[PDB]
Every structure is written in C-alpha cells, then in structure tokens.
Ligand binder design. Structure first.
Ligand SMILES: [Mg+2]
Ligand SMILES: [Mg+2]
Length: 185
C-alpha cells in the first residue's frame, strides 16, 4: 500500500490528506484507471477532503477511464453538499461521458438522477459509444415513468445500438403494451 493521496481519501482521513498535501503530493496524479483523490473524496462525500483538494488545485473536471467526473461521483451517492461545492468551482456534468451516466441511472432505476443530469445541463438522450441509450435500458427495465421522461426529453426511438436494436424494437419483444402504446404517440 503506497502512502498517497488516494490512500487518505479512500479512508476519509482529511487530517492525513492535509498533511500529505502540505508535503507536496500532487492531487492531479491518478491511479492506473485515471482515478484521482478528488474522484474518491467526491464519491465518499467527504467535504473537508474535497475542499482541501480543490485548494491544492485538484482539477474539478478530471475524467477517469470510464469517463466519470467528480461531480457525477457525488451525484450518484447523493452527496448534495459536495455537488454544490463542485459546481461552485466550475465542475460541469458535460465534462464527463453523459451518455454513460444516463445509461447507468437507467440501469439503477434512478429517475431522480436522470433529472439531475438534466438539471445540470446534461443531454440524457446521448448514447454510450456502444449505441445503447438510457431509453433502450428503460424499455428493458420496463420502467414506465422513466420511458415517459426520456421520451419527453426527446429520446431517439429509432436509435440502433451496436446490435441493431432500437428502443421501439425492444418494446415489442417484451410485450409491455403500456410501453408500446407510448411509442405510438
Ligand atoms: Mg474527517
Ligand atoms: Mg496553491
């Protein structure tokens, strides 16, 4: 176990983190997956760690390997105070892979998270690079309300994933009349 900023952030040890920051450790140094201590602090919701990292010039819009950003790490775990502080420092949701974020929210049946992406200016109709969209996923999960919202947000019903399926195509195969009925209008 190396003694680095991630070590402290993972353990929510803001005193240790502070001491390491004063010793000159670089908060913009990331692990093998592009994870920074600010990713981790934002995920754990440790406000003191977040503030100290930002003070020592952690990039508020840092992207890891999955395209995740500190703002999203905080949003997924419901750390509203950290979200506010990150926004104040210039974090934007569209700095990350919003398509991926959107699909993840759909996969977790989390409609409030989908709306928060939109609140912060994210286009939740964007697909993953694989072509899957939150609408695709919403159909599979047969999440009626989430399908509405996504449709109301302008979600492409004829968007083909990499396996040729559109959200509409999927609706017919699951025989969810309620959902197919919504595709007609
Ligand atoms: Mg503490
Ligand atoms: Mg400085």
């Amino acid at each position: 176990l190396p003694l680095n900023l991630c070590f402290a952030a993972i353990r929510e040890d803001d005193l240790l983190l502070h001491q390491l920051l004063k010793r000159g450790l670089d908060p913009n140094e990331s692990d093998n997956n592009g994870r920074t201590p600010l990713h981790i602090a934002a995920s754990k919701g440790t406000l003191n760690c977040v503030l100290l990292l930002l003070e020592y010039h952690a990039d508020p819009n840092c992207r890891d390997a999955e395209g995740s950003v500190p703002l999203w790490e905080a949003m997924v775990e419901g750390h509203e105070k950290v979200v506010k502080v990150l926004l104040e420092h210039g974090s934007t949701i569209d700095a990350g892979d919003v398509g991926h974020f959107a699909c993840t929210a759909a996969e977790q049946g989390n409609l409030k998270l989908l709306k928060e992406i939109v609140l912060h200016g994210g286009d939740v109709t964007r697909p993953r690079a694989t072509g899957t969209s939150a609408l695709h996923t919403a159909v599979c999960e047969e999440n009626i309300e989430m399908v509405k919202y996504l449709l109301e947000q302008g979600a492409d019903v004829n968007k083909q994933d990499m396996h040729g399926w559109t959200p509409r195509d999927l609706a017919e195969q699951q025989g969810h009349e309620d959902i197919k009925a919504l595709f007609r209008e």
